[PDB]
Amino acid sequence: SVLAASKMVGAGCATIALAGVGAGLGVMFGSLINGAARNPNIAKQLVGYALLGFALTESIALFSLLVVFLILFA
Amino acid sequence: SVLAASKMVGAGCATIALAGVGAGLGVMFGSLINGAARNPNIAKQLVGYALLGFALTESIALFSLLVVFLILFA
Amino acid sequence: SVLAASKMVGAGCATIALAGVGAGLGVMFGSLINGAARNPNIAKQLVGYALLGFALTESIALFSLLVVFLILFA
Amino acid sequence: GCATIALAGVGAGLGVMFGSLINGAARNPNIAKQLVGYALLGFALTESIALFSLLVVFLILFA
Amino acid sequence: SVLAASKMVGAGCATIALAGVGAGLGVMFGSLINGAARNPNIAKQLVGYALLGFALTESIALFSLLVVFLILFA
Amino acid sequence: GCATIALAGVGAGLGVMFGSLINGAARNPNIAKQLVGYALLGFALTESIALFSLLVVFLILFA
Amino acid sequence: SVLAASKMVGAGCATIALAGVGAGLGVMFGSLINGAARNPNIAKQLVGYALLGFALTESIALFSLLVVFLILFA
Amino acid sequence: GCATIALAGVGAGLGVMFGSLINGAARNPNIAKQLVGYALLGFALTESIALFSLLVVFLILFA
Amino acid sequence: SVLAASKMVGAGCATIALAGVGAGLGVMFGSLINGAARNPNIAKQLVGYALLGFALTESIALFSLLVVFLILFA
Amino acid sequence: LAIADTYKVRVTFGQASLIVEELIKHNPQSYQILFNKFRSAISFKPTVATILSPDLLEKQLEDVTGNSLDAYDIEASHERSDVLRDLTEFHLGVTLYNAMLENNCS
Amino acid sequence: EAAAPAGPKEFTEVWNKKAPSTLIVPEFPSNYTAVKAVGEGQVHGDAFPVNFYTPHSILSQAQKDTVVLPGVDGYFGVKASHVPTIAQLKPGVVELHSGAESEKFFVSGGFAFVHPNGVTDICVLEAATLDQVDPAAVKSALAAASAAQPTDEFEQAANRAAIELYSALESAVEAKA
Amino acid sequence: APSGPFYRVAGMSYLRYSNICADLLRNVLKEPFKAKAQARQAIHFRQAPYVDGKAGASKVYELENGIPKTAN
């Protein structure tokens, strides 16, 4: 039961990739607050850029959670 | 009992990713202070962008924390 | 006691999450001093956003010690 | 699992690149839908590395 | 005693939490200098923010040394 | 697997380089496509690290 | 003696806190150079604020090395 | 492999260095030709770290 | 031969604190070149701030190399 | 100081700028300009137009429950006391150019 | 901080303590402006008031929904409820847009004020409209400017100001439709 | 000595800097328009310091191509 041991250690290191998306989501969601404080009449377009960027930054967060499940349960 | 010894070290290194979320979520709450210092006439609007962003990056703070409970109890 | 020995190396791995959440606090409480110097009429309302963000980024820090209460004493 | 910690930096690289889009589109909003034309070129070329890490993740797990 | 040796190898890697705490603390004191350089009149008020955030960013260091004294001495 | 953590930092440098591509062209759109030359001049040299690090991965795996 | 072998591999990872302490330390004297170039008149008061923040950011660097000694010499 | 993570930080080094020319040359394209001289001076001397990290990578593998 | 072997791997894991002290020193030396672009008539006074701040940033690096030589040679 | 022969060919902004600069050789806290404003061809009401010096006195009159100038986000290359120095001299050069155009046709 | 509330009406009473009454109280440039800065309004959704001004001529007092101004950090764009901004401008192109049609002046350098009531105030000295610039002297003038490397600081401040106005005029005369 | 922009650290005011950028922009117009902008380029006045209430020297300005670019 050492193969079943490293599947829960190799799944631990695998999700530290979520530290990077949590740093990147907070920069962008901070960049909209500073962005919508410049000229808030384009703000409903900038949230269309934020939740386009929150969509693609979380996509590699789900590439890593796919790999977290592939070491854990595959 | 090396498998239970593998889950405490695995979920412990799995929750390192709360550091990058805690670093990102403070940038966004830092832009909330800085963005509302430019124009306070949208400051109660901008906290609607900060608390929207707080929910969407603490999404990832629970995404990694899902794996810590997915390791220790499954 | 190899089960309980891993519960302390995993508890040290969990405590690295408290690093980056201090970085997000120094970024945010940095932005208070930049913001309140920009517009010192809002010098205490910007504490109202700092302690709102300090209490919601220590939402992450209290999650991190929740794991340290979960691998040390469980 | 130590191979896919390389998704951390592209995950923090993609947030700055999407962040300077909102900082670029708020400064000059008349070319805002042009700046997505450089941002999507920036997205595909940062996830170029995110597949190169995933080149190695699948090269260890199944090869 | 693998357990007693594990009260060192965990408590050492528990104290990487003071890295991101120090990296944040140099930002918030770094913004005190720029915040005093912008507005040199209210520099005696902003040190009442740069010490306020120091006692609230040592909140996480008093949660990390809460943990290193729950491993080495508990 | 621990070798290819070098792909994290090069992908983080990209989004700063591709963010200031967006930002540099929001502040000077008269050279908006000339900076794309400067950005891909940066992109041609920063993935040298992403091919200096993929060699050592392919120097462990089969060499 | 693995009891002492864990003391030297533990105290090694105990001083990676000094990475982040030196990271904020350059950032703080980075804004001392910048902030003195904004306001050259208040530039020596900012020296009073630089060494103010240096002592308080090193206070956790002298919290780190005692834990390096609370592993090795305790 | 564990030594090659030093090449991650030199990847975020030339990424912020090349991103400072896209900001620098867009601020003034007067010296847009001169500034590439300092980035390429900055490029080779930040690689000075890369072949010193690849000094020991091409040492402990083969000595 | 574990006490002679662990003091090598604990030494290389100790000198990672020369990463952030190089990241901080590179910001402060870059903020010196930026601070001369703001105010070139004050320029060789801020070099007095950089080298003083370099020697105080190196108060970390000789404290971390202290740990490297102490476990290689206590 | 006596400036004369101003209205001989025509009055320009570059001419009013050098008259402004010699008022900046002296370094006061304020300026007062006295001229006749051309309301109509009949009425020429004498105007007092005044310009405060930037970080000496202009910033000090704006400190009304904090400051009135902090609402503006300065997009200069240097900080606010240097953009206010350039802005007061530009305020002095146009208030003087308008003064000797209002007074020339009055 | 506010220990002397001055103003135009406050100059009335003190001058009515020390001057002869046969002179009435003189007028002030505050009396001849109908639009102030702090008072709420005058944005009404899409179009804010812009005021492009030179010393010698007034070039627009109309309403636009967007202005593109060449700041010293770069070309920014002023939307309707923009942040208050006192922005220095380098030599560049002011683009006043009210819709599909575009009036684009190349300016010499001078400030632009966005106010707390949404009104934009462009204040330049020389405004060269982009269809009346000489495209044969933009390149001949930078050549002697890039070679004149003198020993005095004044012309070094004047030569650095010389090429940066010309260099942003090459990039403002080539790619026009 | 001083602190500020590149014109301010060389002993040049803002009005002297920003007229120079208006001087050099007038030259690169069309001659239909350059001769019109030539009219506002000429500076003709005279200043005189008055030390005693009675006398002083005087300094005549006759520049037709714009502000003095030289160090004054």
TrEMBL record, chain J:
| Stated family | Belongs to the ATPase gamma chain family.
Give the source lineage, highest ranks first.
Eukaryota, Viridiplantae, Chlorophyta, core chlorophytes, Chlorophyceae
* Localization: Mitochondrion inner membrane
Q: What is this protein called?
A: F-ATPase gamma subunit
Please tell me the species this chain comes from: Polytomella sp. Pringsheim 198.80
Q: Which residues of the full protein are shown?
A: 160 to 265 of 317
Q: Which gene encodes it?
A: atp3
UniProtKB/TrEMBL annotation, chain K:
From what superkingdom does this record's organism come? Eukaryota
InterPro entries tied to this protein: ATP_synth_F1_dsu/esu (IPR001469), ATP_synth_F1_dsu/esu_N (IPR020546), ATPsynth_dsu/esu_N (IPR036771)
**Keyword tags:** Hydrogen ion transport, Ion transport, Membrane, Mitochondrion, Mitochondrion inner membrane, Transit peptide, Transport
Entry's transmembrane regions: none
* Subcellular locations according to the entry: Mitochondrion inner membrane
Q: Name one GO molecular function term.
A: proton-transporting ATP synthase activity, rotational mechanism
Recorded GO cellular component terms are: mitochondrial inner membrane; proton-transporting ATP synthase complex
The ATP synthase F1 complex delta/epsilon subunit N-terminal domain extends over 50-120
- Record-linked Gene3D superfamilies: F0F1 ATP synthase delta/epsilon subunit, N-terminal
Mainly localized where?
A: mitochondrion
Q: Which PANTHER family match?
A: ATP SYNTHASE DELTA/EPSILON CHAIN, ATP SYNTHASE SUBUNIT DELTA, MITOCHONDRIAL
- Family statement: Belongs to the ATPase epsilon chain family.
Return the protein name: Mitochondrial ATP synthase subunit delta
Originating species: Polytomella sp. Pringsheim 198.80
* Taxon lineage: Eukaryota, Viridiplantae, Chlorophyta, core chlorophytes, Chlorophyceae
